[PDB]
Design a protein around this nucleic acid. Structure first.
Ligand code: CL
Ligand code: MG
Ligand code: MG
Ligand code: NA
Length: 330
DNA sequence: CGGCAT
DNA sequence: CGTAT
DNA sequence: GCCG
């Protein structure tokens, strides 16, 4: 064989695709590689999983892997075992291991990453109750993640997104007339559920947005909508108290402010997927010699920033065919 | 051999 | 270290 | 783990 470019940003990856079983197995090995501190192996297994999501048809025979980027001996053997037996011994040993299950449990807590989870694992901790019994080990961010863990493990749905966008738009409009709110993240790519809601805030007049996020946060906090926040800043990783009929649930919400000159770059970065953006930035630097992030696209020879009005402008400047958000699900 | 996004 | 995609 |  199939047509397959080597970078995920060069090919469409739709929301609904084939080979979910094969990709899920490779993503288990990627996660486990991360848990052992091998970010390179994580990245290869993620890239190989992503290739399968971009294929036109189900992989049913090993020969369909011929020539595909990021498939070598190890990834091919995993697929071969799945095709020949319906299960991969390595994947089953990993996913049934105490180490994997505990690291997954701990790293899923807001405020805990691999290095913290591994330190706790090496100290003999295994359950969330173990962490509660030792609160001296916890940052304030981790305490919030642990307190609200049950709600934060519940998928966020589109009905939640619509309610949250309304309250964020109200606070933003009270904080700065003319400011706008754009849904980004997975929901902009067409996902039906998520672990959080991501919003990008700007104003059409450059500079007006300076100092906006503390004003938005204060207005949300005064409506009783904020369970946790990190506190001059431009990103806020919040836990909202989202009203529900007769009750409420905690929801993770990310808010990001950008000046309008940077909006297309911030929109592109925060729409994702994570792998899509890593691959796009790798492409930009390695193939074009340009440095990309959510603030801009920098030419380090001329020492200039590319002025973009749209995501389409950024793709075109990089020599890439434009992909809409729903084809960025790498 | 070292990179692997910013 | 953690967080965003 | 794969590849530039
Ligand atoms: Cl979905
Ligand atoms: Mg999200
Ligand atoms: Mg987010
Ligand atoms: Na975490």
């Amino acid at each position: 064989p199939a047509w397959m470019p080597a970078y995920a940003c060069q090919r469409p990856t739709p929301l609904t695709h084939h080979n979910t079983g094969l990709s899920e197995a490779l993503e288990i090995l990627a996660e486990a590689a991360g848990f052992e501190g091998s970010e390179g192996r994580l990245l290869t297994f993620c890239r190989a999983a992503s290739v399968l999501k971009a294929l036109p048809s189900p992989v049913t025979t090993l020969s369909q892997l011929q020539g595909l980027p990021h498939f070598g001996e190890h990834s091919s053997r995993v697929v071969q075992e799945l095709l020949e037996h319906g299960v991969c011994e390595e994947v089953e040993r990993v996913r049934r291991s105490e180490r994997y299950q505990t690291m997954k449990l701990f790293t899923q807590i807001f405020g805990v990453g691999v290095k913290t989870a591994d330190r706790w694992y090496r100290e003999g901790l295994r359950t969330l109750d173990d962490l509660r019994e030792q609160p001296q080990k916890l940052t304030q961010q981790q305490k919030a993640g642990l307190q609200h863990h049950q709600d934060l493990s519940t998928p966020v749905l589109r009905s939640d997104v619509d309610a949250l966008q309304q309250v964020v738009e109200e606070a933003v409009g009270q904080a700065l007339p003319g400011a706008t709110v754009t849904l980004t993240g997975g929901f902009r790519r067409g996902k039906l559920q998520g672990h959080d809601v991501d919003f990008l805030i700007t104003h059409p007049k450059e500079g007006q947005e300076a100092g906006l996020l503390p004003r938005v946060m204060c207005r949300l906090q005064d409506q009783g909508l904020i369970l946790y926040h990190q506190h001059a800043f431009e990103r806020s990783f919040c836990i909202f108290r989202l009203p529900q009929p007769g009750s409420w649930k905690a929801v993770r919400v990310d808010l990001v402010v950008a000046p309008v000159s940077q909006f297309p770059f911030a929109l592109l970065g925060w729409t994702g997927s994570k792998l899509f953006q890593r691959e796009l930035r790798r492409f930009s630097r390695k193939e074009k010699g340009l440095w990309l992030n959510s603030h801009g696209l920098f030419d380090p020879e001329q020492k200039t920033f590319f002025q973009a009005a749209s995501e389409e402008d950024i793709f075109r400047h990089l020599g890439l065919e434009y992909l809409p958000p729903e084809q960025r699900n790498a």
